[PDB]
Amino acid sequence: GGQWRLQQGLAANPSGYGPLTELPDWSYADGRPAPPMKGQLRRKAERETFARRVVLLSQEMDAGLQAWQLRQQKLQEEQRKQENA
Amino acid sequence: PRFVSLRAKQNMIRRLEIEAENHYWLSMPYMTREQERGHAAVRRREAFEAIKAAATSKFPPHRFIADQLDHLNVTKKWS
Amino acid sequence: SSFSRAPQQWATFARIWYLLDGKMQPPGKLAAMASIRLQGLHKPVYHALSDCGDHVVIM
Amino acid sequence: KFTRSRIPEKVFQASPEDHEKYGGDPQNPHKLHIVTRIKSTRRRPYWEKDIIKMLGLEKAHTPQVHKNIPSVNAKLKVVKHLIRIKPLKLPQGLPAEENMSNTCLKSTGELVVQWHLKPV
Amino acid sequence: TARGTPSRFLASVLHNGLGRYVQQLQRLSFSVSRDGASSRGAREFVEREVIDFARRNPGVVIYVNSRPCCVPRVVAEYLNGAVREESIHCKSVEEISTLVQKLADQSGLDVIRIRKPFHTDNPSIQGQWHPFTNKPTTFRGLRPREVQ
Amino acid sequence: LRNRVTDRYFRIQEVLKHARHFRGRKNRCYRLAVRTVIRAFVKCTKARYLKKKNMRTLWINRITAASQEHGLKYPALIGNLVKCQVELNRKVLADLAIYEPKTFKSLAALASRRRHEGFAAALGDGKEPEGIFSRVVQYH
Amino acid sequence: GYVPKTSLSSPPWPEVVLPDPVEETRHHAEVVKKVNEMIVTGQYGRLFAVVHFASRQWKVTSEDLILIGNELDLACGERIRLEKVLLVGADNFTLLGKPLLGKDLVRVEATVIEKTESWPRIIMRFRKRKNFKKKRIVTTPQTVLRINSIEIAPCL
Amino acid sequence: TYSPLPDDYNCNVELALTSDGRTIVCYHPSVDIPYEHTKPIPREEGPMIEQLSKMFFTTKHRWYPHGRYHRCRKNLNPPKDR
Numbered sequence: 001g002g003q004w005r006l007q008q009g010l011a012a013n014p015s016g017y018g019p020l021t022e023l024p025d026w027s028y029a030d031g032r033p034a035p036p037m038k039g040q041l042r043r044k045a046e047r048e049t050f051a052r053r054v055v056l057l058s059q060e061m062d063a064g065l066q067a068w069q070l071r072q073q074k075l076q077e078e079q080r081k082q083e084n085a
Numbered sequence: 086p087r088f089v090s091l092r093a094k095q096n097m098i099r100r101l102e103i104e105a106e107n108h109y110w111l112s113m114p115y116m117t118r119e120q121e122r123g124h125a126a127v128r129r130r131e132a133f134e135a136i137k138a139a140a141t142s143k144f145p146p147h148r149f150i151a152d153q154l155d156h157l158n159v160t161k162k163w164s
Numbered sequence: 165s166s167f168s169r170a171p172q173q174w175a176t177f178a179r180i181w182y183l184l185d186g187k188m189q190p191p192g193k194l195a196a197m198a199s200i201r202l203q204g205l206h207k208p209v210y211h212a213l214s215d216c217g218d219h220v221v222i223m
Numbered sequence: 224k225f226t227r228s229r230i231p232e233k234v235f236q237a238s239p240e241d242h243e244k245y246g247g248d249p250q251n252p253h254k255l256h257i258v259t260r261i262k263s264t265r266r267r268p269y270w271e272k273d274i275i276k277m278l279g280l281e282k283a284h285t286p287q288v289h290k291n292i293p294s295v296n297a298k299l300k301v302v303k304h305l306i307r308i309k310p311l312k313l314p315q316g317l318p319a320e321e322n323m324s325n326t327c328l329k330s331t332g333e334l335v336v337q338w339h340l341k342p343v
Numbered sequence: 344t345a346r347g348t349p350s351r352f353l354a355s356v357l358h359n360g361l362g363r364y365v366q367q368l369q370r371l372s373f374s375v376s377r378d379g380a381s382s383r384g385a386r387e388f389v390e391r392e393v394i395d396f397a398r399r400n401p402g403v404v405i406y407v408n409s410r411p412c413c414v415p416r417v418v419a420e421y422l423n424g425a426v427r428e429e430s431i432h433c434k435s436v437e438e439i440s441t442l443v444q445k446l447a448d449q450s451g452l453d454v455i456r457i458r459k460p461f462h463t464d465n466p467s468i469q470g471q472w473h474p475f476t477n478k479p480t481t482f483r484g485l486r487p488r489e490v491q
Numbered sequence: 492l493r494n495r496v497t498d499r500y501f502r503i504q505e506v507l508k509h510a511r512h513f514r515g516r517k518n519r520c521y522r523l524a525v526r527t528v529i530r531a532f533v534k535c536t537k538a539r540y541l542k543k544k545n546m547r548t549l550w551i552n553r554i555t556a557a558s559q560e561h562g563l564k565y566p567a568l569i570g571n572l573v574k575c576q577v578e579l580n581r582k583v584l585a586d587l588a589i590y591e592p593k594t595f596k597s598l599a600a601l602a603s604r605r606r607h608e609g610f611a612a613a614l615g616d617g618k619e620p621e622g623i624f625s626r627v628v629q630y631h
Numbered sequence: 632g633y634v635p636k637t638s639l640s641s642p643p644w645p646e647v648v649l650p651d652p653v654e655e656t657r658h659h660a661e662v663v664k665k666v667n668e669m670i671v672t673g674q675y676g677r678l679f680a681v682v683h684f685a686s687r688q689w690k691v692t693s694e695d696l697i698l699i700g701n702e703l704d705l706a707c708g709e710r711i712r713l714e715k716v717l718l719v720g721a722d723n724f725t726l727l728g729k730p731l732l733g734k735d736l737v738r739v740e741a742t743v744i745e746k747t748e749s750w751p752r753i754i755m756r757f758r759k760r761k762n763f764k765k766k767r768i769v770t771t772p773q774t775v776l777r778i779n780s781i782e783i784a785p786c787l
Numbered sequence: 788t789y790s791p792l793p794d795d796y797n798c799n800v801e802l803a804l805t806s807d808g809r810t811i812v813c814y815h816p817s818v819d820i821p822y823e824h825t826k827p828i829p830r831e832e833g834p835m836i837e838q839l840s841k842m843f844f845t846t847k848h849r850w851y852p853h854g855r856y857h858r859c860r861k862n863l864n865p866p867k868d869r
């Protein structure tokens with residue numbers, strides 16, 4: 001029953017993101033935290049490269065529009081500075 | 086002869102609904118085609134110069150004295 | 165709980181006689197209830213090889 | 224003969240009814256798409272197989288970020304029956320280098336830049 | 344296959360974690376040729392690793408025999424009287440170290456098929472299901488079509 | 492014969508230790524034992540998929556039976572336990588059904604209570620207070 | 632809007648009237664107080680936890696064994712607190728979390744007994760008339776855990 | 788007066804949330820059988836296979852023997868558990 005979980009903003013599969021799969025399964029009995037799970041390290045690597053891609057594409061879009069606005073402003077300056085003499 | 090159940094119609098329909106929303110989100114680009122031009126030419130060129138560079142840097146590995154002599158250890162014995 | 169091993173095992177797999185009055189009833193809708201209780205598919209202890217069917221008396 | 228299909232432009236023009244249906248604004252549109260493959264390239268022509276490989280959607284049910292520019296939209300229009308597109312919405316900002324590791328893309332379509340595992 | 348092989352249930356030796364933990368590995372018996380190309384990695388294991396290993400677990404008594412063998416062996420004996428003879432023939436020191444630590448970490452029970460992945464000895468707490476759980480009783484214990 | 496094969500008893504015996512429990516001459520005659528032994532190993536690996544499948548249908552049979560004891564049906568129980576954020580799985584629910592039937596009765600009570608709040612909530616539509624067991628715990 | 636009582640006038644299911652949330656939240660407070668008194672005064676006997684160790688849910692009492700299909704990279708003998716317990720039951724009460732219980736509520740301990748390998752496990756592929764026959768033999772690593780104790784705490 | 792199941796036969800189920808709304812407390816003590824709901828304690832191969840069939844309500848086939856090949860494949864020391 002995962003369409004319900006999509007209604008609530010959860011992962012459609014309870015083995016997705018969230019507290020069942022991302023907290024560590026075990027600790028030491030002293031209370032020392034375990035070394036991290038292999039799948040959680042892998043998964044954090046995937047999420048980080050995804051975030052880097054979001055930032056990278058966003059910045060290329062913004063730099064793209066700024067460079068276009070310089071080309072338009074300099075076209076208009078080349079219009080007004082050639083209507084003289 | 087094969088006939089169409091309610092499962093098949095409801096499945097077909099939910100695919101049609103995903104499709105219609107794909108039509109919606111493709112109807113409003115962030116840039117025009119004039120604005121996007123060359124906005125990523127540098128990164129594409131550097132990426133291909135990396136592909137090109139890994140292609141043209143292919144050569145036999147270094148050979149070492151220590152490996153060849155290290156084969157002598159197959160008759161290491163005790164005393 | 166706190167039974168011995170043998171009477172616990174006897175209690176779990178014991179089979180139960182059910183009565184089922186079929187007056188003014190359809191035979192397939194009787195047959196479904198009867199079939200479930202004959203295979204033991206109404207028990208959570210069910211398994212095919214474990215042989216846990218019951219008796220159904222239809223009058 | 225089975226050929227490659229052009230799709231007319233009236234198909235990709237939203238109506239205000241659709242702006243009431245989905246959550247979109249025609250002014251100030253979204254920058255990034257999330258694309259997911261939800262259908263197989265098997266039994267599909269080789270050009271659609273290729274476009275799926277270019278967009279980086281070889282694995283199904285795995286989201287991919289794209290730009291909402293007309294080039295990427297052209298490739299998406301070719302394989303729009305195999306994918307799902309949602310806008311990448313960002314409730315907080317795009318992640319800085321401090322919040323780069325601690326992100327999570329949720330199911331809603333939003334990308335949260337602080338992902339604790341505590342209840343609110 | 345499973346129908347060809349014997350199987351067993353998941354067990355310990357003497358309830359091995361309840362009270363205290365006991366290393367189930369009693370003896371190792373290395374036999375290593377002095378001059379011989381197959382027991383090279385055994386030789387470098389006795390010289391480098393066997394003293395450290397022998398100190399990391401003192402409940403294990405280790406015998407290095409060093410006769411002219413043509414294949415070197417290790418013979419693990421366990422507290423429940425099982426004997427696992429494995430060869431260390433043409434193995435590196437690292438491969439022998441992982442094998443010896445493998446023999447240390449395990450118990451003497453067979454590595455045949457294990458039927459269930461778990462073993463409770465008290466599986467039920469609220470009382471196991473019998474067909475009169477989840478059934479109501481009647482007044483005076485009557486059954487259907489019972490007159491008085 | 493310059494070099495003919497000496498070590499052939501052991502190749503045969505590598506196959507035939509797997510066939511010792513067949514019937515007929517498949518247990519002894521290498522030519523027959525090879526076809527049956529191969530075929531046994533192929534079944535042995537395709538049976539991992541069916542082991543997983545058949546356990547799951549076995550659990551659905553046991554949860555179905557145990558939940559029919561409390562009047563619920565299986566879709567009602569599983570659905571309305573997901574909706575309580577009780578993400579127990581089928582193996583555990585079947586084992587609770589057999590070994591802990593009060594916990595299973597209380598889970599059936601929690602699932603039918605949630606089911607009724609689903610009914611009453613989706614009947615009196617509009618802005619209203621949500622159900623008590625209907626509330627969800629947001630994780631951030 | 633009256634309909635006279637026919638077969639199909641009303642729906643066939645009987646109407647349930649769920650209780651009002653004032654008396655119901657008060658009633659819950661009474662129940663949680665009762666059960667918290669049973670946890671304080673130690674009324675319970677032995678517990679069973681459902682624990683989400685590794686990738687699957689283990690139903691677990693004290694003094695038992697779990698065989699896990701991977702090397703945990705712990706020494707034999709090390710005690711472990713299993714987090715992610717998601718049901719805890721006694722004879723007269725249970726406690727079930729949404730989806731996990733509080734770490735301050737339940738504590739499940741387990742030691743590592745042994746770190747074995749599996750029995751050798753065949754992987755054969757064969758397609759007819761194609762000369763297609765591969766064979767592989769796999770042994771997965773395994774560790775056995777002994778659940779020592781399920782301790783419960785009065786934090787309701 | 789609401790009961791989500793007829794708390795009559797196995798245990799008296801009493802559900803609860805806590806104030807945080809994070810754990811569901813179930814309380815379920817056992818239902819004892821009443822004294823009023825109880826009764827006081829009262830104080831040849833062919834025909835033999837038909838007689839056993841009719842006695843144990845099974846068919847006839849499991850009373851015929853089986854050959855040596857099947858009697859010797861049987862595991863007489865099978866693994867025990869619990």
Ligand SMILES: [Mg+2]
Pocket residue numbers: 544547
């Ligand atoms: Mg399946």
